[PDB]
UniProtKB/Swiss-Prot annotation:
Keywords: Cell membrane, Cytoplasm, Endosome, Golgi apparatus, Lipid transport, Lipid-binding, Membrane, Nucleus, Transport
Primary residence: cytoplasm
Its membrane topology: Peripheral membrane protein
Name listed for the protein in its UniProt record: Ceramide-1-phosphate transfer protein
Catalytic activity: N-(hexadecanoyl)-sphing-4-enine-1-phosphate(in) = N-(hexadecanoyl)-sphing-4-enine-1-phosphate(out); N-(9Z-octadecenoyl)-sphing-4-enine-1-phosphate(in) = N-(9Z-octadecenoyl)-sphing-4-enine-1-phosphate(out)
GO BP of this protein: ceramide 1-phosphate transport; negative regulation of autophagy; negative regulation of interleukin-1 beta production; negative regulation of NLRP3 inflammasome complex assembly
Annotated binding of an N-acylsphingoid base 1-phosphate, by residue: D49, K53, R98, R102, H142
Disulfide bonding pattern of the chain: none
Family designation: Belongs to the GLTP family.
TM stretches of this protein: none
Cellular compartment(s): Cytoplasm, Cytosol; Golgi apparatus, trans-Golgi network membrane; Cell membrane; Endosome membrane
Gene Ontology CC entries for this record: cytosol; endosome membrane; Golgi apparatus; nuclear outer membrane; plasma membrane
Length: 206
């Protein structure tokens, strides 16, 4: 196992029509969770939640409706057109649309964090890299108590070297090189998803 193989799921999930394939999206996140877990327990407040939502998506994708959950685009077209998603402030609490929204937001945090990890000085402060990434993203969807608790938790995070080493590349430098190759794919998937959700007024699904 290694992070390069994991992030390549996000290159693979993209079609030449600009669609995001659900199956590779799930697999990329399954790998990211495995990575987060290899760094202790500081991330379980994100990781445990991410895993539960992935299970929700796998059940949708294995379902008799499987053809509809083939891509994020087809999911949205289907769930909206058949009124299967709660747009306001609830009859469908586990819809694909609202579930992927959380994965999407958490993915934004994970992308900025990994990119911060990549461009930083050697002995850079992990709690800091993470905290800037979080405040830019997930913090906008958490409560004061959560933001405060989480921000303190970041101080228990391993060193940058322990992070890069956890990526299981041949070397620390190679890991940094790998991130520069991979993140653009993660970002593109995020941008496509964000636009898709924006254009359908799904950015605040309950």
């Amino acid at each position: 196992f290694n992070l390069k193989v994991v992030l390549v799921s996000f290159k693979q999930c993209l079609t030449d029509k600009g669609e995001v394939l659900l199956d590779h999206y799930i697999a990329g996140w399954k790998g990211l969770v495995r990575f987060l877990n290899s760094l202790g327990a500081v991330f379980s407040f994100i990781s445990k939640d991410v895993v539960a939502k992935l299970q929700i998506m796998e059940r949708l994708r294995s379902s008799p409706q499987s053809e509809h959950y083939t891509s994020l685009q087809s999911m949205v077209a289907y769930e909206v057109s058949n009124k299967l998603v709660d747009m306001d402030h609830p009859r469908h609490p586990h819809s694909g649309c609202r579930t992927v929204l959380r994965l999407h937001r958490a993915l934004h945090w994970l992308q900025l964090f990994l990119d911060g990890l990549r461009t930083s000085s050697e002995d850079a402060r992990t709690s800091t890299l993470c905290s800037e990434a979080y405040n830019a993203t997930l913090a906008n969807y958490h409560s004061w108590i959560v933001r405060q608790a989480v921000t303190v938790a970041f101080c228990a995070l391993p060193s940058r070297k322990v992070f890069l080493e956890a990526m299981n590349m041949e070397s620390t430098e190679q890991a940094v090189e790998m991130l520069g190759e991979a993140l653009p794919f993660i970002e593109h998937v995020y941008d496509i998803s964000q636009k898709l959700y924006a254009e359908h007024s799904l950015l605040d699904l309950p």
